[PDB]
Design a protein around this ligand. Structure first.
Ligand SMILES: OC[C@H]1O[C@@H](O[C@H]2[C@H](O)[C@@H](O)[C@H](O)O[C@@H]2CO)[C@H](O)[C@@H](O)[C@@H]1O
Ligand SMILES: [Cl-]
Ligand code: NA
Length: 472
């Protein structure tokens, strides 16, 4: 039983728009912050790579559905490119070509018995909105509402699963370095917190919008996808345990405390540590933005499920390090990784499958067992079809998740593997491979071909169990 998926559990795979679509300026699409980064700052990206073509999924979406059907995916999670739909960011102009494209993908999926799951924002902000300051500027909350309305109106008759934002803990860091993630702004400890504040407001506006304008007719569900690493105490001390709790609150709780708790607001430890640090460093005002009581009430409860993006673990010990000001410094933990853990092609990603089970339990206890949909989980290598490391990564993580479900009572309701295919890996370009399908980026046809991991995942999806040969 511990090796069998619940009957209603949904299995599939996932992608993101900039990572796969290409057609970056085709048929009216406007520029986004990733177009800007890869065009203006190729020195920030391995090989000077761009997403101009990527997997060419704008043209090849039927091939994506074909491989999803082969895989036996029940669900496909993909994102919508804001600037493909609203080229100016604001809702004054709707690009029919973008409407047609996503309709064509949705219809193709449904005709092949695959459910669409749509992420509204996976990091590709229209440049016109970044030029107002981007996420640190609260005006973007209403702009996000208006974007979401166009999506609900056009697609919500057929799309019943939505995520507002993907991994805002990661994308907020685009406001914490001059050479980092788009838009590559150096405001650590100040602008990144403002970005988070706006995103939380935006998410809440989108959820209320669904309630007010769409839910009764459409009957779908709206969540948010949060990334989080497990943080294991470096030793069993109370002090090291405290540092790991700090980590969870500063990374997951930053977003999840305002939305998923009865109390709402940011975690107390976040408010208190930033307040103290700001005062000590001479600021009149805390660097952490504040919610009013009315905003706290508006934001709390804005969820039908929790999306989780899980990859890895860190070790945490008591202490403070990092630059002043920064979120890492404010968090009051010293982070390392254990040399013994298996590696990947990504410096940040080590294989720690039991950390997945620990994280799922932490979430269950902190948020009163919300329905959890694993929206990303996956592994990098440098290439190859005989991807034994990736096969092991998936079979172990899925076993740990199934223990969380069956042994620990965690309400996990679905899982989409990251990623369906090798794609543009952000600042790493095409150098790191996360796909279960390989893609030849030197071949203009961008053929997708199954790796061993795709064959193993198909077997899991078909049999609805972990095969015997992968069991402990
Ligand atoms: O692009 C791969 C994957 O990255 C995720 O972010 C990583 C980040 O790169 C790393 O520095 C940090 O320690 O861990 C996070 C994951 O928690 C991002 O969240 C994913 O959405 C993305 O697909
Ligand atoms: Cl066997
Ligand atoms: Na419209």
């Amino acid at each position: 039983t511990v090796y069998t998926f619940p009957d209603e559990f949904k299995l599939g795979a996932a992608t993101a728009s900039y990572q796969i679509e290409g057609a970056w300026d085709e048929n009216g699409k406007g520029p986004n912050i990733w177009d800007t980064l890869t065009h203006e700052h190729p020195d920030y990206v391995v090989d000077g790579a761009t997403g101009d073509i990527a997997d060419d999924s704008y043209h090849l979406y039927k091939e994506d559905v074909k491989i999803l059907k082969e895989l036996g995916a029940q669900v496909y999670r993909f994102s919508i490119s804001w600037a493909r739909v609203l080229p100016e960011g604001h809702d004054n102009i709707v690009n029919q070509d973008g409407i047609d494209y996503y309709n064509n993908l949705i219809n193709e999926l449904l005709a092949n018995g695959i459910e669409p799951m749509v992420t509204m924002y996976h990091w590709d902000l229209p440049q016109a909105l970044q030029d107002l300051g981007g996420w640190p500027n609260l005006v973007l909350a209403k702009y996000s509402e208006n974007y979401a309305r166009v999506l609900f109106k056009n697609f919500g008759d057929r799309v019943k699963l939505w995520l507002t934002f993907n991994s805002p803990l990661t994308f907020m860091d685009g406001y914490a370095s001059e050479i980092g993630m788009a838009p590559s702004i150096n405001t650590p400890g100040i602008g990144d917190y403002l970005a988070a504040h706006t995103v939380i407001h935006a998410h809440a506006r989108i959820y209320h919008l669904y309630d007010q304008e769409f839910r009764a007719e459409q009957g779908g569900k709206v969540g948010i996808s949060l990334n989080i690493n497990w943080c294991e105490p470096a030793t069993n001390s109370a002090e090291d345990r405290a540092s790991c709790e700090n980590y969870q609150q500063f990374n997951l709780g930053l977003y999840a405390h305002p939305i998923f708790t009865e109390e709402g607001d940011y975690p107390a430890v976040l408010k208190d540590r930033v307040s103290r640090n700001s005062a000590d460093e001479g600021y009149t005002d805390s660097r952490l933005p504040q919610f009013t009581a009315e905003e706290v009430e508006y934001i709390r409860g804005t969820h039908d499920f929790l999306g989780i993006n899980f990859y890895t673990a860190l070790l945490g010990k008591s202490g403070v390090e990092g630059y002043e000001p920064s979120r890492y410094r404010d968090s009051g933990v010293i982070l390392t990784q254990d040399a013994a853990w298996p590696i990947s092609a990504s410096s940040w990603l080590k294989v720690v499958p039991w950390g997945f089970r620990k994280e799922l339990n932490w979430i269950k206890n902190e948020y009163n067992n919300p329905p959890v949909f694993i929206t990303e989980n996956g592994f990098s290598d440098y290439g190859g079809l005989n991807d034994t490391g990736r096969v092991h990564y998936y079979t172990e993580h899925l076993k740990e998740m199934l223990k969380a479900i069956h042994e620990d009572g965690v309400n996990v309701i679905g899982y989409t593997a990251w990623s369906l295919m090798d794609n543009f890996e952000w600042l790493r370009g095409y150098s790191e491979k996360f796909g279960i399908y390989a893609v030849d980026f030197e071949d203009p046809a961008r053929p997708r071909i199954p790796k061993e991991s795709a064959k193993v995942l198909a077997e899991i999806m078909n049999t609805r169990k972990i095969p015997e040969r992968f069991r402990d």
